[PDB]
UniProtKB/Swiss-Prot annotation:
Function summary: Part of the ABC transporter complex MalEFGK involved in maltose/maltodextrin import. Binds maltose and higher maltodextrins such as maltotriose.
Gene: malE
Induction entry: Induced by maltose and the transcriptional regulator MalT. Permanently repressed by cold shock in a PNPase-dependent fashion.
GO MF entries: carbohydrate transmembrane transporter activity; maltose binding
Oligomeric and partner information: The complex is composed of two ATP-binding proteins (MalK), two transmembrane proteins (MalG and MalF) and a solute-binding protein (MalE).
Keywords linked to the UniProt accession: Periplasm, Signal, Sugar transport, Transport
The organism of origin for this protein: Escherichia coli (strain K12)
Protein name: Maltose/maltodextrin-binding periplasmic protein
Cellular component terms per the entry's GO annotation: ATP-binding cassette (ABC) transporter complex; ATP-binding cassette (ABC) transporter complex, substrate-binding subunit-containing; maltose transport complex; membrane; outer membrane-bounded periplasmic space; periplasmic space
PANTHER family, per database record: MALTOSE-BINDING PERIPLASMIC PROTEIN, MALTOSE_MALTODEXTRIN-BINDING PERIPLASMIC PROTEIN
Amino acid sequence: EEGKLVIWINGDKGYNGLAEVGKKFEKDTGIKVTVEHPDKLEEKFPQVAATGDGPDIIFWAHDRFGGYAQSGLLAEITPAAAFQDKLYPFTWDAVRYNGKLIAYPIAVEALSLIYNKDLLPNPPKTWEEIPALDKELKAKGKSALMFNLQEPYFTWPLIAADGGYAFKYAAGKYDIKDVGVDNAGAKAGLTFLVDLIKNKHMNADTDYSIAEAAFNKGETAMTINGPWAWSNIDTSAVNYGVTVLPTFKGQPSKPFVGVLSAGINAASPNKELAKEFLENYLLTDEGLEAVNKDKPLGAVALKSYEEELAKDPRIAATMENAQKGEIMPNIPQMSAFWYAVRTAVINAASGRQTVDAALAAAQTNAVDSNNQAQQMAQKLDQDSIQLRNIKDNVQGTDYEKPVNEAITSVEKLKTSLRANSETVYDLNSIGSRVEALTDVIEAITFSTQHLANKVSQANIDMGFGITKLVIRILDPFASVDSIKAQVNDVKALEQKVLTYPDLKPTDRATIYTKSKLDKEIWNTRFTRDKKVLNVKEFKVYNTLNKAITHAVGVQLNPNVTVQQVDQEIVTLQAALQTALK
Ligand SMILES: OC[C@H]1O[C@H](O[C@H]2[C@H](O)[C@@H](O)[C@@H](O)O[C@@H]2CO)[C@H](O)[C@@H](O)[C@@H]1O
């Protein structure tokens, strides 16, 4: 509406300097400006500006905004010369798309490496120096490095140093057939990172808040972030540097440089009131100090303030980083690229995939599969291909009902983004639900390969605990945290069970230990039909067929002890060998 103001910015930037300028605005001109910080605000801005609803001005790195021209969601913009001289013209170049300048350059972000000067005389300017410093600090009681291992923005400098790239620019355009994510020095960086978590130099589970927690409480020796994050380190009491990132393979690290930009809503009649706040009270000195006292913007586009905070050696080494990197593309195919790359670092540092197999899926997805949605549908199809697979395998078991509900769940989520769009489920939770399905699968996998040699209550608990997970996975009531906490219980349950007494060779043998004699029966009939059936003469077929009927009799018995089964399998793999003359 015309009276109130709403701005969408990210809850890691100076939103609490953007409220301030709101009150240096209401208390001046009779227009209140109360400022929001939605979650996922870059991926809801599509599905709500297609309904004529959105904040009055949207703030993000310039790389999404250009998809907001391929659906018209942003409005054209035009200031005067005494103002396009007031900022730097290369940031005007970031928001330009098809001539039509479609947003306001506020400031220029860049990931810069942050260390501890109390711990470290001088940081390792080369990335290979660092594993030799974690195994040193793996004695002092501290770590070496943590940063967000969950959004690909943070890994992309390493990947890019030896020559990973998003899209090759070629005499005017980016070539959307020439993606550089599965190239050679891509694989170098990704592989190099894998090892460090692997050698417990980092942890594959580190996210934003945990790494911001870690470096500031001061356990780990280093971190990496934008300038929005010095705020909470200014706020805590760690003595740092802010340096160039290390050089992996003698080449610098190359961060994707973001321009924090301010578009303007598509269907907005507030377009007049928008381009007033943004120039007079924010994009100035008085305004930029308030947003920068809160969460530093690094290098502010505004020549008058950039030249002030330029003496700041943290910003002079933010720039040193942002010139060794590359201003991102704003083309709409970026989104599809990021998510494609997001999946691979998740899937590598974890282990679900090898560095090469990841990057090749990531490349294919980037060159064509430009649907943020169709990528998820793929991951689920793989799960159900494997869920359906693990079903026939492990069934009649304590795990049938967790399996079959997950299968139903892998199919419920899939429509929720396709032709259904009813979505009993909230949007923030989609990705969390789907990644949790990977966590369900790995628990069905853990439980079938390590618990089957125990008392059935070990297998009872996990059986129930995986069903609890698929339930929260399917509950519209469960929020993103309600799920993650449930996912860490199923991981917590896997330790609890291993405490239980292993089965005892006199005990009534559990289905699982009868699941082992049954696999020998299937192996022996398959080997028998293949290498005996016509092959050797029937007198010896008969006196193997009996050892099957006998070995079946042992697992139709309910009162069979473990020991009575163990020695029955020895029979077959000495009676199938007896029938190998
Ligand atoms: O990592 C994927 C994500 O990266 C970029 O987002 C950055 C953003 O540029 C910064 O404003 C800040 O919020 O950190 C973000 C990642 O943690 C891209 O802008 C975005 O499209 C992409 O999905």
